Amino acid sequence: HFLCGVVEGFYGRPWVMEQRKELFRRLQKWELNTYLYAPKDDYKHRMFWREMYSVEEAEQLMTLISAAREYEIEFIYAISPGLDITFSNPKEVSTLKRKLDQVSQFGCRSFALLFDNIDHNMCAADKEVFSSFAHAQVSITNEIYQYLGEPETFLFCPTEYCGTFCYPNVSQSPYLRTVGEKLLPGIEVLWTGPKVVSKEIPVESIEEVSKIIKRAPVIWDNIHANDYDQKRLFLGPYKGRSTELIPRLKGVLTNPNCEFEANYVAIHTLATWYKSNMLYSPQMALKLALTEWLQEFSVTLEDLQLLADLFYLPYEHGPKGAQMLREFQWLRANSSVEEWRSRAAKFEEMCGLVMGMFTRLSNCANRTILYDMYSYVWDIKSIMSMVKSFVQWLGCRSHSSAQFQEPWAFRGGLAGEFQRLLP
């Protein structure tokens, strides 16, 4: 009854039904049990939440919920009336119930209300019926909970959904102090850790949150989410989460890369970590995930080794990539022209391996995988070309004065220009 798997909860292009089916197959292939549907930019999930699914949309949602049972993965349907709704208006409540009614007849048993990412105070009308902001959300959550006959699993994502998002601090919050106390115990609470993207979740921090929440929370985990940075992708192991945590949480749902095929390592390494304590080593999980991924693709394990190292984790590059960095850092500092030449050549080779990994990746069989990742790898290949080129220039300079134009030499457009003027 412990929930572990994926939440499709990012901003941007959501997945299509053919990706979400391929998602389920993988989930039980590796023994995870849950899927939360909360893609921020499906218009009907959040942006136009009162609105009924169309006839072609109904067909699609039913086929999906079907495949969920066909794979015995539990399907949770989220909705997000956060920024819009009038809590104290009962037609507003009715439309909310009408909407959830529509989805239950698609085959759907598990439900969730999300109140992440919205303005901290209500309209003139709301200031009356409810004493505080936190009071208003619970009213409808509970009113809803019961309406569905108090279903199997029903999640609640708070406005203050992580440590830094708790005012003034985490255990001194009127908001979270209200929620714990006035929210039904048949209802789950989502939490993302100390931050939105958490480098690590200490066992202590959950005990602390669990006491103000008066439950064991389900983690919405942003460790592999890439929606907040165009250049960024994350193929590292599930890391910074103690196996010690499984006893203290009702689940973990991973919010992963927008690009579906990139999420292989993300979901697999999460799978093993949960298999561990239902300790665990990231450096090995990755070794398991990467060899098995290599099946699906020409490209070597060494190539993927390099690939995940270049696109590792939101606060950590991978071994081969950290090394390539400090190396280029030393080389540019020490600019004598003893050993310096020795290390230029060694670096220049390490560059050619990126060019290598890119080539064999493009020549590969599995075209869906290539595409989800193409721009991410083309970018790294091109910067490493300039970086090889630049080290080349720095060596061939005791014998030249030639100072260091197509557009891809200066980069990032207008965004890049503003970015470079920031301290």
């Binding site: 901003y11 920024l83 990412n117 939105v196 907040y228």
Partner: peptide, 4 residues
């Protein structure tokens, strides 16, 4: 993350 986001607001409007």
């Amino acid at each position: 993350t986001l607001s409007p």
